[PDB]
Chain A
Amino acid sequence: FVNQHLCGSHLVEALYLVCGERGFFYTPKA
């Protein structure tokens, strides 16, 4: 099960840096 979880921790740090001011929404599924 783990690489999906480990990657979401990097995906949310790049989202945070790229969105910047506008904030963001993180949901796993859908």
Chain B
Amino acid sequence: GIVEQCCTSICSLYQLENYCN
């Protein structure tokens, strides 16, 4: 879920704001 898109291409603060509870 986590690792593939965001370790191959850079995730942004608004995009990781979605992987919050």
Listed in ascending order, the chain A residues whose CB lies under 8 Å from chain B are: 3-4, 7-8, 11, 14-15, 18-20, 22-30
Which 8 pairs show the lowest CB-CB distances between chains A and B? Answer: A19-B20, A7-B7, A30-B1, A22-B21, A22-B20, A23-B21, A18-B16, A24-B20
Q: Give the interface size class of chain B.
A: 10 to 19
Q: How many A-B residue pairs have CB under 8 A?
A: 48
Instruction: Determine if B19 and A24 form an interchain contact, defined as CB atoms under 8 angstroms apart.
Output: yes
Take A4-B7, A7-B7 as given contacts and tell me if A27 and B16 are in contact as well, using a CB distance cutoff of 8 Å: no
Residues of B within 8 A of A8 (CB): 2-3, 7
Contacts of A30 in B (CB 8 A): 1
